[PDB]
Symmetry: D2
Subunit: 291 residues, 4 copies
């Protein structure tokens, strides 16, 4: 037994702006993605996985967990994040599994198609897809939101997911899983996250509808809804700098989550024994009590 409250760092944190998408290695403190704590138990042996945004944050924690549970792992990421991605590749390989690094921008439809084709070719198949990449850039007013800002968030968080998922489904055998990362913002819908929250609510409806389409074919589609986590998405403008300094201070634990803490949700949803979880949204928000 461990008290979860003081298991991880609490605010205040140092001032630390990065340009998006940021690097985990440059945060203060660096996030804990489970590098030391996550121990596998053979729960996903021989599975074949693609995790978008697997270089850092929640995607990285999921990639590490999958590899240690016996799964081979391809990760997508943006080229600017190469130094974070190389760490994850090294962690996958140290677990004795195959790692594939597939950099590119999922706003580009033809890249989405190439990404899935090359992941499946490299792995000799595909049977866990995690749509986790996201753009998040806070703005206090719609007056400041250009079409370029709105479009970048929607193209990353909705179109990219649509294109990748559509390309993936012909590869996925019965027994496979799709997992989409959404956010408590889907319904908390902060004033400063107008476009982001719009997409995160959309992801949940997409998940539920696609689960009804694919469930009869033996493919399960689910979503994970984090509350506030210590990731480069936040310190590179997902929240303003002063919010980052005091991130989640007012929450029940008085601290943000660390990515390590949410990896178990992804493993549980993908595992073959969790066979009646389909169309679900599983939250991990530290007591906000949203999903």
């Amino acid at each position: 037994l461990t008290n979860p409250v003081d298991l991880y760092p609490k605010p205040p944190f140092p001032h630390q702006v990065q340009a998006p998408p940021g690097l985990a290695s440059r945060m203060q403190p660096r996030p804990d993605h489970g590098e030391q704590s996550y121990r596998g138990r053979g729960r996903l042996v021989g599975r074949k996985t693609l995790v978008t945004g697997g270089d850092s944050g929640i995607g990285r924690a999921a990639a590490i967990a999958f590899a240690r549970e016996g799964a081979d792992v391809a990760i997508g990421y943006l080229p600017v994040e190469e130094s974070d991605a190389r760490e994850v590749v090294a962690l996958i390989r140290a677990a004795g599994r195959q790692a594939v690094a597939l950099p590119g921008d999922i706003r580009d439809e033809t890249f989405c198609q190439r990404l899935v084709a090359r992941a499946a070719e490299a792995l000799g198949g595909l049977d866990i897809l995690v749509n986790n990449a996201a753009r998040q850039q806070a703005l206090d007013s719609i007056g400041e939101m250009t079409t370029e800002h709105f479009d970048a968030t929607v193209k990353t968080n909705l179109y990219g997911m649509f294109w990748i998922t559509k390309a993936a489904i012909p590869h996925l055998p019965p027994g496979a899983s799709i997992i989409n990362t959404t956010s408590v913002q889907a319904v908390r819908a902060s004033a400063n996250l107008l476009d982001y929250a719009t997409t995160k609510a959309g992801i949940i409806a997409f998940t539920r509808s696609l689960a009804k389409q694919l469930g009869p074919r033996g493919i399960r589609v689910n979503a994970v809804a984090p509350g506030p986590y210590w990731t480069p998405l936040q310190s590179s403008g997902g929240q303003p700098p002063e919010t980052v300094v005091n991130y989640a201070a007012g929450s029940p634990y008085g601290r943000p989550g660390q990515p390590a803490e949410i990896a178990p949700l992804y493993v549980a949803l993908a595992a073959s024994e969790t066979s009646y979880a389909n169309g679900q949204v599983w939250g991990a928000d530290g007591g906000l009590g949203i999903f």
Copy 2:
């Protein structure tokens, strides 16, 4: 007192297919938008309103009610719907008010700006905005959903709303109202409405976030969530023809709604007396009991 169950038509309806967006005048029965039944009582006197998709369906019922409550009304619609729109223009003027007809495709960002500008110019201002136009085209499988189909739905239902709303805010005085039409599909998320349900959940988060931005400025932003209603959106491919024949037969009333029935929600949300309703989603789904 009237028993609502028996107040309006019940299925089965005759087999009837139209190409989208369809005409209300070609439905059997023609929808009841309140042309004979809605009596105004001075609840929106002198208001200045823009209703997208005001030619037919729910938007037409809202436009008729607004005019009879003393508001001037501009309606958007697509050019092929001119014969429906002309009826709404005549109903607005018959109530003694000013009508403005503004056909154009809201997937076009520049038309969205033109629509708002011309509505405000003609009416001498703008203080009720109703984002109600939508695309809905049922498809049973993501495998048959093209990027063109997905994009048409997202550009109509999310980008059009964003562009129109952003262009309208500089016109809106303290005390104004924005109302966005969403759907029970936001959470019912049927297998055959993958892109549509995505957008309708998005609209709710957009409403909630914008309400937190604009509430402090004195502008209220709310959503209306219809269940199934008898409109040309459904018989022009929003549902497959045999579902249209049997539309809402399984509901608690055993019948779909008629547009007339939901107009009162739009009047109540816009009324100045409803001054602490902001960020809300008000349902009218006949007992499905969703919002």
Copy 3:
């Protein structure tokens, strides 16, 4: 047009505590239930209504509005609230309608039955029922919550509603309306409102289930979900005194609602024209954006 933000008082409010259920006339400032501002428009002429907790707060605002819309009104309240209740009786009569005053404790099943029977007898019928009375007593820890405390909340807010509603249904003709007051606490579920939040979530499910039972029989059942409002429920222990002093200071308007502002929801849900609103939860929370 008037800015709704500045329409009503903002905190801080004087330190003030009353023994429950409290009196509206002893609050500082006295609440606005629409005594001067609510304008009837002939929307409920000849209806026959029973409002529990109609002496003060939201129920008082609804009772004034119903009378001004042309309905006869019976109000329930606790005997110690006679001084608040007689003001409401006077306002109903000033609107030209019949008032009935029916004090008693709805935790008493036999009283619940007498209440409904005497209301219908005195009015000559019954066709709007508003279950609005509630108990709310904040407590920081379950360790301090006696069975007596938990039972008082559940018996008032769940059993009382059940008994009154069961007794009323044989009187209610097709076309009648039942409205249940719930709370954003149903899902906000504050730490200090453990028993209360339980009951308010229960009320929503009760509303939805009963709407599916009675909808087919021509009786609509709906719920209203207020956010924070300035009523004696709060300064008599519903929130601790320092919260009352700063009540809703952190909300988008920076003020709580006044009961006057939510009356239009009760009128709209009761009106015959709102005929496809059944099983709904309509929020009025000032921009929290919950229901």
Copy 4:
């Protein structure tokens, strides 16, 4: 490897099979699968000390088996008439090498709730996983037929019982402990024939969320699980009418109800010490209804 979940378990139609409540799993046709043969532990709850109400049958039985195989000692509550189901669970717990405790009694009685927790904690040498899973569910088509006795039995079992047990348990729970409450998709599906039941299941979610905010700061996590339709005696003893039971979940995306075996992984995942930022959550497993 990969298995198609659609046809992993039996589909309707099932034979007519009314039981008087609370019913016995051994008298269902077919007998439910609680994971007796299939669930393999992996040392995820070693040394934990657990109390599961309604652990004789159904979802609670599946949780009990999984907890024991993951290394936890397990006390179960149930009603005396279910002794024959409970004795099987006791044997499954012991065969995993754990301590089992059988604590029959009716949780509508406040005094029994207090003694249930005291006796569970005493027998196990502590308590650090509480699963509030017992429930009453009796379908009725109209409120006119619903007596105060019927309403009260559902509310006393599903809300008051949970309240009394939870309150008595909290002084025993150390930091790192878990409380898990079983709710239902009926919390928001709110069928016409489950008026009192749906009321309580929505109530359970608000109770979970509020208590998570109370206890989270002290290191105790409070969460809920939201099943869709599962093959259990709660349904065939009147939770649904007989014709619905015959065709249970035929119209769902898989065309079949869940078997309790399938939901046990949710209870293990919520309780595990590594799942340390899950608090106040409602995790659904409804086979594609897509509710929680």
